[PDB]
Each structure stands twice: as structure tokens, then as C-alpha cells.
Symmetry: C2
Subunit: 216 residues, 2 copies
Amino acid sequence: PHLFYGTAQNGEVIFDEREAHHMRVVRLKEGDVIEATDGNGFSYTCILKSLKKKTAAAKIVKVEEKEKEPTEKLSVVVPIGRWERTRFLIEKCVELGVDEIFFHKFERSQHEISLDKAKIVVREAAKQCKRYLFPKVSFLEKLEFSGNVITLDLDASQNLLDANLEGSITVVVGPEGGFSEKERELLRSSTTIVILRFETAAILTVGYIALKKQKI
Amino acid sequence: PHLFYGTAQNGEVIFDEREAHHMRVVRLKEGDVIEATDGNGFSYTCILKSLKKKTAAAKIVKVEEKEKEPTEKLSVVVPIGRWERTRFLIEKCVELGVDEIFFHKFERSQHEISLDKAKIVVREAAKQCKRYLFPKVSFLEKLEFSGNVITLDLQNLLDANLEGSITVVVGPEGGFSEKERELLRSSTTIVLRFETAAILTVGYIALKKQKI
Ligand SMILES: [Cl-]
Ligand SMILES: [Cl-]
Ligand SMILES: [Cl-]
Ligand SMILES: [Cl-]
Ligand SMILES: [Cl-]
Ligand SMILES: [Cl-]
């Protein structure tokens, strides 16, 4: 049971080139009943009409609201770094029920991110996890926040299980080359700080928090 | 800075062809200073004396105790299933401070494993992670247990009582059979992508037991 992604309007869902290729791979055809999401919490049961090289369109039969906006958000600051790390962190954020991703370039990174690429990673992950309401993605200029913030310092574990998790939480995943001293002063003074393989620490940290917050 | 695995005897560490080959891949030569572990908690700083095709030997210069046996053990029963899953679970056991790994072929698996092959996975993961006291591996013929055993189907694991030595039963890819669901309820405490779930669950337990 595959879940496609498109834009609903005027009784149809329209699909971009990327989706049409994915449908040709599953070898669908005109007449087939399919399920799409718009990424804002809705599910559409549709009959495929057109499948062409760079586009497709299906007629909507049924809509179900599958997920509503949460009252308390889980936010993660993802460092703009080597693509393999960045793609991983974004995928895990979809997976672990994060509501908002914020991309920050820490002082020791010279990387950039394409926000359109990040949205594709979110889309493809969500289609796999059957997540109807996609996390939002934004740039973040400054390490300035409100509410409860937890910082994952990758170069040191601190006590995660002692941390207070009351209310809305932002988790700040640290950069590969480490916080500069300016960043560290800024984050010690404003957040709560908490050695394993990068991929394991990130899953365990964000995943424990999501668990406790019942985001998963 | 690599870490090799060898056998310590009378002032030298000897190494097998797997390690010798690895030494050649990383361009080591006779006369270089290397670090080895025995897999028993100790680090050995040695001078590499002989690097041959099938074997190597180094002279011990310094020995440091890195890791001791814990009072309270964390054991995990790993299903014998598709290699890619089994290998991942072995490596996470190494990395998350599990002390002992027991392989069980559940009823809906038809797979088999050689302990020699599992040990190689342990070795290579432990070399990579710089774990000096390697976990032990063995077969578990029956799902028959004593002690705190908790049975996992990859939430409110957060409420599980994890005190004392503990065994964690990770279920098979095809699910527990009826007989298995009954058997496990008679002797255990029943408490996302597979890899994510496996890390979050075993990691949380390890972290709560302070094994990491
Ligand atoms: Cl890159
Ligand atoms: Cl990019
Ligand atoms: Cl951009
Ligand atoms: Cl980075
Ligand atoms: Cl299995
Ligand atoms: Cl071995």
C-alpha cells in the first residue's frame, strides 16, 4: 500500500514529475484507485486519470482528515552540514514526530542547504512513515529561543534522563566540528545541555524526548 | 588510531590473518606502535615486530585496564533472522553496552547463524567502537527464563521496571507465534522503522541502567 503526495484543488489531486516517476515504478495505470496526502493532514482516495512523463492527476472520491496541528510543538534545530548527516537528521525528525525543523549554520560549518531539497527529503520520508501532516522547515538566523530548550552536545553526553521536559521543547542538535565558545556560552546560559556514534545519539536523544512528549 | 584484536602471551600479542590483512590495508609496517585489546577489558600498547601474510606479532610495551566485568548484567536475546537485521542488532548490542547476546531462532524464522560469524561482527564492531571487554555470544535453545526478563515487540517501556540484572527479548520479524506469546507471558514481563526502534529501545534501557 503506497502513499503518494500531491496538491488537492477543484476535486483533483495533481502530482509533479517526481511522483509520476514513482507511480510508473509501481507500474500504475489510468483507472487505478490510489491514496495521496497533501502533507497538511489530509488523505485523498482517488482514481488515476492521467499519468504522463512529467505530471499526473487523479479524481478525488473520498477525503479524510488524518492528523490535526498539535497544540504543543516539538522543534529541532538541525545543523547545516555534510549532506549525509543533514539528510539523516531530517529523516529522523519526520520519523520521530518532530513538528518543526530549523536549519542553522553553526560557526564552524561552511555548508549550505537547499530548502527545496530538504522538503523532498521530508516528503519522501513522510510518504514512507505514512505521516499526513509533514513537519515545516525554516531557516534560523540566531540561537535565540523561547521556552524549554535542550542542547545535544555531540562531543559530550550529559544527563538526558534528568532533564526537565515540561511544555513545548526545542532540541538543538550540535554541529559536527563542535560548538564554538561563543555558541557554547550562548547555549549554556539559555538551554539545558546533554560518547556515542552520531546517528545513535541523535535517535536516542530526540526519540526519548518524542516518547516522553508522546509525539510517538 | 586503530585498535586491533589479538591474543596476549608471554610479553607479545599475536594476531590472525583478519588482523594482519587489516594492518596492511591501513599501511602499518614492522616497527610501528600499535594498540591491541584482548577482548577481556585490557589495552596493550605494542611495537609491531612481525607482519606476515597469515599472522602478526607485536611486543607489549604497556598494558592498561580499560573495562571490568559489571556487577549487574544486561543480556539481550537476538532473533536469528535475515542477516541484515541480525548484524545490526549484534552491532547495537556491542555499542550500547549489552554484556551478553543469546541467539534464538523463533518459530517463524527459518534462518541459521554460525557463532564464528557472529563473533567476527562483535570483533569488528568492538574494534571500531573501542570496546575492550567484548560481549559473549551463545545460543539460547528455549525461551525459558528467570530474573527480570522483559519482552519487546519493536512505548511505556518508560514505565518498565529495569532494576537488577535484566534480559531483553527482541521479537522476530514475523511476530511471536501463539505458543511463543503464551510461553513468554508465563515467565517474562511484556512491555517506527526497525533500526530506529531497536536503538531507541535498547538504548533507553542501557541508558537507564547506566551501561552507556
Ligand atoms: Cl556534503
Ligand atoms: Cl543542499
Ligand atoms: Cl534555499
Ligand atoms: Cl555541522
Ligand atoms: Cl526474525
Ligand atoms: Cl572473532
